[PDB]
Ligand binder design. Structure first.
Ligand SMILES: O=S(=O)(O)c1cccc2cnccc12
Ligand SMILES: O=S(=O)(O)c1cccc2cnccc12
Lengths: 346, 20
């Protein structure tokens, strides 16, 4: 067969150790989920890092920098995101993984909800990808491996993520990925039905109004790996409806510089037939982790953050924001409480 | 090229989620 005796025994033991790690991780998650912080004047507001509202760099007045997310309650209501948003705070307080951004404080006032997270200073993968143009296959693989491990973790907790895209992946000071934005994350032991996500990254079963499951995240991983290695996504067009036509068609074309191993992996991730899509089969995530394109990946070394990253962003000190774009800076909290009943639990 | 078609699409910037 493909593996000799030593190799097969090593892989077997590695897979059983993953099961052991995940069982403990699910126990910690459920304990925190069952039994889950500050105020606006505790922080000096510095500048706006990104755009329901804005994310701002703040300095806690222990001197540490954080990214403070500000959500207008009326906006959350108008976009019908009330349950998605209360759930995002609950998920972020309860999970724990090296590639998931860490929530440190939460609170609210008359008009806004606030989530204070660790500041990830290296900027969005999106910016780096558009600037460099495309990532080499080893560079794309280093990032992909972190997403594989992160989805393996989240899916073991029965959480579907549903918003993978380079815009939602931050690069930290060591060049590793931080997943942000859990507004669409949900516990789904079986199926769920909400039409949500980003057009380029939607699995066909979402577009076709089906009940769907965590397999949509593995489709989205295929889209991400393709966009990282090509510089552009596998399905695009002027308007979303034409993008959906390409996604459901069952056809994908690849750049001539893609390796044969990469094309084979992507044809198995970007698989319209759910009975054939990697991540959705009897062997689960092992079909992905054991694929030839990942043969050089040391999964435990990635998890321990012992692999040298291909890209280390510029860090000129604490509070440096040079990796983020510039946005217009605004100041206001209403004298009356907005949407009090809808957000009582936040 | 496919890259030129990507530029022509107008969807090269940060992309919004559906609910926007
Ligand atoms: O904003 S929520 O309350 O979360 C919400 C979720 C789903 C459908 C909705 C339809 N009309 C109003 C609100 C809705
Ligand atoms: O500014 S954003 O890119 O929207 C963003 C969102 C959530 C957490 C973040 C942590 N550090 C930097 C930026 C962050």
């Amino acid at each position: 067969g493909h593996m000799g005796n030593a190799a097969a025994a090593k892989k077997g033991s590695e897979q059983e150790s993953v099961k052991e790690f995940l069982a403990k991780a699910k126990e910690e998650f459920l304990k925190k989920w069952e039994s889950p912080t500050a105020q606006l004047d505790h922080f000096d507001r510095i500048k706006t890092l990104g755009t329901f509202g804005r994310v701002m760099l703040v300095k806690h007045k222990t001197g540490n920098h954080y990214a403070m997310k500000i959500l207008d309650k009326q906006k959350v209501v108008k976009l019908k995101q009330i349950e998605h948003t209360l759930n995002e705070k609950r998920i972020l307080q309860a999970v724990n993984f090296p590639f998931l951004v860490k929530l440190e404080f939460s609170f609210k006032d008359n008009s806004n909800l606030y989530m204070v997270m660790e500041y990830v200073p290296g900027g969005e993968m999106f910016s780096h990808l558009r600037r460099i143009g495309r990532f080499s296959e080893p560079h794309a693989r280093f990032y992909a491996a972190q997403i594989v491990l992160t989805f393996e973790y989240l899916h073991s907790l029965d959480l579907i993520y549903r918003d993978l895209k380079p815009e939602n992946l931050l690069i930290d000071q060591q060049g590793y990925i931080q997943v942000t934005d859990f507004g669409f994350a949900k516990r789904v032991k079986g199926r769920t039905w909400t039409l949500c996500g980003t057009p380029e990254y939607l699995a066909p079963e979402i577009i076709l109004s089906k009940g769907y499951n965590k397999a949509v995240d593995w489709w989205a991983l295929g889209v991400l790996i393709y966009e990282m290695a090509a510089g552009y996504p596998p399905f695009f067009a002027d308007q979303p409806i034409q993008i959906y036509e390409k996604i459901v068609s069952g056809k994908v074309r690849f750049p001539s510089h893609f390796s044969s191993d990469l094309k084979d992996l992507l044809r198995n991730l970007l698989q319209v037939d759910l009975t054939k899509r990697f991540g959705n089969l009897k062997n689960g995530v092992n079909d992905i982790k054991n694929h030839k394109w990942f043969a050089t990946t040391d999964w435990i070394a990635i998890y321990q953050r012992k692999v040298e990253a291909p890209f280390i962003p510029k860090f000129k000190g604490p509070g440096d924001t040079s990796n983020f774009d510039d946005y217009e800076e605004e100041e206001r909290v209403s004298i009356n409480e907005k949407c009090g009943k809808e957000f009582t639990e936040f | 090229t496919t890259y030129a078609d990507f530029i022509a699409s107008g969807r090269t910037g940060r992309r919004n989620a559906i609910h926007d």
